Amino acid sequence: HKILHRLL
Amino acid sequence: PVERILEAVTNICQAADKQLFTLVEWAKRIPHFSELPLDDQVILLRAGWNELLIASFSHRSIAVKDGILLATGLHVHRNSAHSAGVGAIFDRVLTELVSKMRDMQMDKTELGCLRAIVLFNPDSKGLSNPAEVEALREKVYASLEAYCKHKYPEQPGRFAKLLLRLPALRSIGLKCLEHLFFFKLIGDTPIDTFLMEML
Amino acid sequence: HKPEPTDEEWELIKTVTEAHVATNAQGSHWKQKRKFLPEDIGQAVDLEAFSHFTKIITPAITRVVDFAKKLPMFCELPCEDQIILLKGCCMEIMSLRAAVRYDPESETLTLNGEMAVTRGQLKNGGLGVVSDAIFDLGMSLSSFNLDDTEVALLQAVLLMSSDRPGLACVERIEKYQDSFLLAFEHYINYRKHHVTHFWPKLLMKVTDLRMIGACHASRFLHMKVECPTELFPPLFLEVFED
Ligand SMILES: N[C@@H](Cc1cc(I)c(Oc2ccc(O)c(I)c2)c(I)c1)C(=O)O
């Protein structure tokens, strides 16, 4: 839902 | 030998004095518990009853969908809980516990041992001899592993999964403690006489 | 009889193990690359202490996520559940990782495999009582002496918690956890630990960990009550913010 996504 | 364990205002005050009685007598019927120093017994009880109670009705509510059956048979639907602001916590009990208990067909034997482990919590602060308590707990889930090996040999991970419900049970315990008060506000050592008597 | 792991399981074992290894900081040379945080820092929510934990917490967090991505099963989950699993087990795994790095001689933990802190330091650093919970755990794990594998498996199981709030593929995640647990249980049988009641004792730790992350969640609320919102790194927020 934020920086988490781009880290996925 | 979990066989001896398996065999083990005026309205709201009638209960509790009964539930607590049934819990204490349940613990007394637990192997080696009545052998611990008086102080060590009450400290355990008072440190676990939260989770013990919750482990009870959670297994009893396996015969109910989206609801909980309590002492007075007073079935509790999730509609009241969310309306009382305890929906979140209520749901956890259904999904993390009641659900998990049903889907594995956890029997009364496994429930009893799980509750026996809980009671023999060696981490509890203040008790005179921890080494002795953790000993007892060991002996407790010692039996549990053998029971699962013989009773359900087609499923090896059963024993393991049985323990992994304690974590859920724990954190849920905590939420309940934070939710409910009053009793605690009655200062320290508000309950010890009875525990000393039932002893 | 103790059923040793099967061939289909060893594959998952080497998978998870490699997953943990590539993502644990300092690898196996952490003891020499660690630096003791000044005894002055954090005396008896220390702004300074906190600022140092938070200044190195974002890499930890990411490194955790990396461990997840190196797991095929986890990569099979919807982005929705994918996020939830992390947010939950995040603090738990980091705690594990930190706790398995306890040094009796020093009575200190190694954060990111480079920062040694004491019980007090980590307590005044925002964790408070959690610090105890963690050190105590580390103390307990000392006699276990777990290897990368056994630690990787725990992390693995922690991740695949089918009881996190808001999950969709619950029965799917639960199946994965059951797979890990099976292999986990067999691996230790292979290890042939001489201590009595190793598997159960270890499983209880999962309880301990799940309780740490929880107290940590309540700590975070108090932290944003005292400490400012600017003192918090973006990634950190996202991780423990609802
Ligand atoms: N050492 C770990 C990473 C790790 C990093 C840090 I900073 C830790 O401390 C915390 C954590 C959350 C907080 O809110 C505060 I304040 C301090 C821990 I516990 C672990 C590893 O190797 O993965």
Author numbering:
A (entry chain A): 687 to 694
B (entry chain B): 231 to 238, 265 to 455
C (entry chain X): 210 to 253, 264 to 461
Tell me, in the authors' exact words, what the paper reports.
To further detail the structural mechanism by which TRβ allosterically silences RXRα, we crystallized apo-RXRα in complex with TRβ, T3 and a co-activator peptide derived from SRC-2. Consistent with other RXR heterodimer structures, TRβ and RXRα interact via the conserved dimer interface, largely comprised of helix 11 in each monomer, with additional contacts from helices 8 and 10. TRβ adopts the active conformation when bound to T3, with helix 12 forming one side of the co-activator-binding site, allowing the docking of the SRC-2 peptide. RXRα displays an inactive conformation with no bound ligand or co-activator peptide while helix 12 docks at the AF-2 surface. Compared with other RXR dimers fully occupied by ligands—including the RXRα homodimer, and permissive RXR heterodimer complexes with LXR47 and PPARγ48—our structure of the TRβ·T3/apo-RXRα heterodimer shows a marked shift in TRβ helix 11. This shift induces a rotation of RXRα helix 11, which is visualized by comparing our TRβ·T3/apo-RXRα heterodimer with the RXRα homodimer or with the apo-RXRα tetramer. Notably, the TRβ-directed rotation of RXRα helix 11 in the TRβ·T3/apo-RXRα structure induces a corresponding rotation of the adjacent RXR helix 5, which in turn disrupts the active conformation of RXRα. In contrast, in the TRβ·T3/apo-RXRα structure TRβ-induced rotation of RXRα helix 5 in the heterodimer provokes a clash with the active conformation of helix 12 that pushes both L276 in helix 3 and M454 in helix 12 away from W305 in helix 5.
NRs harbour a C-terminal ligand-binding and transactivation domain (LBD), a central DNA-binding domain and a variable N-terminal disordered transactivation domain. A subset of NRs functions as heterodimers with retinoid X receptor (RXR), and thus provides a mechanism to integrate two distinct ligand signalling pathways. Second, RXR heterodimers that contain retinoic acid receptor (RAR), vitamin D receptor (VDR) or thyroid hormone receptor (TR), are ‘non-permissive' for RXR as they generally do not respond to RXR ligands, or do so only in certain contexts in the presence of the partner ligand. Here we present comprehensive structural analyses of a ‘permissive' (PPARγ/RXRα) and ‘non-permissive' (TR/RXR) heterodimeric complex, which defines how a non-permissive dimer partner allosterically silences RXR.
